[PDB]
Every structure is written in structure tokens, then in C-alpha cells.
């Protein structure tokens, strides 16, 4: 079972729509959650015109029912200081449902 040792700020961006059918993201902070972060094999990735530096980073938080603020959704992101962990999906580790699997990237531009 996980050792939730690291503190991560959950961040949901409120989506103000613009004129052309898109939205605007500002990323205000939601509450702070404790989670363990487990790195996978990391390597460079050909970005757009950047040489990014990605790592898999499976993140384990505690769970919640789906209509609650303590559930990280995949449109959210984590942040430890200035390290932006994205969220790819959440996936319910245990059989009983105590913990979740977040999946990050944390791609600094290298």
C-alpha cells in the first residue's frame, strides 16, 4: 500500500470561453493533496521545436466519489512548487477503492 509522503497542489483551471469557440485557462489552485510519486523510465522527446524531457510519474492519491473535489480529473494538473505534473487518467488502484493512479509527465524543456 502507498506511502503518501509528498505534498502536491491540485489545480483546476476555470474555463472562460473566448469568441472563437475555444476557452481560456488560468489554473487557479484547488486544495492540496498528499501523494507518492513513482518515476518511470525517462528520456528526451521530440517536441514541437523544443527538446522536451519527460518521465512517466505514476502518482497515487487517496480516492473519493466522482462528484467530489478530492477526485483529480484528467483535465487538472498537479504542481509541486514550479513542477507541473499533468494528469493523464485516474484509475482506482486497490480492489476496495482506497487509492487512485494518477499519471503525470513533468516535461521540462531541457
Amino acid at each position: 500500500r502507498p506511502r503518501l509522503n509528498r505534498l502536491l497542489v491540485l489545480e483546476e483551471a476555470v474555463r472562460v470561453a473566448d469568441g472563437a469557440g475555444g476557452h481560456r485557462l488560468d489554473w487557479q489552485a484547488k486544495g492540496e493533496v498528499w501523494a507518492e510519486v513513482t518515476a518511470g523510465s525517462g528520456s528526451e522527446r521530440a517536441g514541437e521545436f523544443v527538446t522536451l524531457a519527460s518521465v512517466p510519474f505514476t502518482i497515487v492519491v487517496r480516492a473519493a466519489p466522482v462528484g467530489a473535489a478530492r477526485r483529480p480529473r484528467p483535465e487538472q494538473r498537479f504542481r509541486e512548487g514550479a513542477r507541473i505534473f499533468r494528469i493523464l487518467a485516474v484509475a482506482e488502484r486497490d480492489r476496495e477503492g482506497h487509492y487512485l493512479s494518477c499519471f503525470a509527465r513533468e516535461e521540462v524543456v531541457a
Binding site: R15, G22, F49, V108, V109
Partner: protein, 134 residues
């Protein structure tokens, strides 16, 4: 490249970051070499040229169809279209000064504008033609 293109990129980089708009939309994030850090996310990028050699008996010139891409991580990409509106009016009708040789005109060409990686980044290319003279 031909002899001019070393100074053509140095002139179309210096025409950017002195344009008043896009100093308020993109900011300082106009670069060929992306500096290390957290990757701001609304940058432009000025590298992928290609030359076509419009020359003559007396001397030589060139036609540079250089590409200036605008990248954004925003939800929509009316942000990038507003940023490349600030790119293009800064360059068409340039009246630039080069370091080696002259350019006679800086026109506009194709500008593809699609979704690049994982439907998340939004990159809009801008091909500009620069007929120069060595």
C-alpha cells in the same frame, strides 16, 4: 543556404521583439533556440528556412521561404491566430536592413494551421517569402 540567410534570420528576429504588439501577447518568447526552463507555452519559433536561388549573370540572389511557427498550449487557438496576426503585419512590407546584402521584398505565402501533438499543442506555420540579393 546562400550568403544572405545568415543575416536574414538575424533581421527577421530583430524585427520581432521590437514590434509593440506580440510583446504583450507572446512576451519575450520569440526564439530559435528554446531556452531551458518550464516552457512558457505561447512561444513562436523561427528556424525552418529553404532557399530557391533566384540569380543572374551579374551577382546572385535567393528566395527564402522561411517558416515562422506559432505554438500555443491554450484550449482554443484564437490565441495563436491573434499572435500570428501580430507576426505577419510586422513582416509584410518589411523595409529591413541586412548585414550582408539586400532584400528587396518580404511577402507572405501559405500558412497551415493545425493541431500537432496529441491534440493538445496548436501550431500555426507561417511561410514568408524573402527575395534577397547577395
Amino acid at each position: 543556404s546562400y550568403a544572405v540567410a545568415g543575416a536574414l534570420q538575424a533581421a527577421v528576429y530583430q524585427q520581432l521583439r521590437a514590434d509593440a504588439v506580440l510583446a504583450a501577447l507572446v512576451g519575450t518568447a520569440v526564439y530559435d533556440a528554446v531556452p531551458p526552463g518550464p516552457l512558457a507555452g505561447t512561444y513562436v519559433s523561427l528556424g525552418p528556412e529553404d532557399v530557391a536561388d533566384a540569380s543572374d549573370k551579374t551577382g546572385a540572389g535567393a528566395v527564402h521561404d522561411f517558416v515562422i511557427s506559432v505554438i500555443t498550449d491554450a484550449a482554443g487557438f484564437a490565441t495563436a491566430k491573434a499572435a500570428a496576426a501580430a507576426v505577419s503585419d510586422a513582416l509584410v512590407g518589411a523595409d529591413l536592413v541586412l548585414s550582408r546584402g539586400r532584400l528587396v521584398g518580404l511577402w507572405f505565402l501559405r500558412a497551415k494551421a493545425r493541431r500537432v501533438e496529441k491534440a493538445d499543442m496548436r501550431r500555426i506555420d507561417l511561410v514568408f517569402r524573402a527575395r534577397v540579393e547577395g
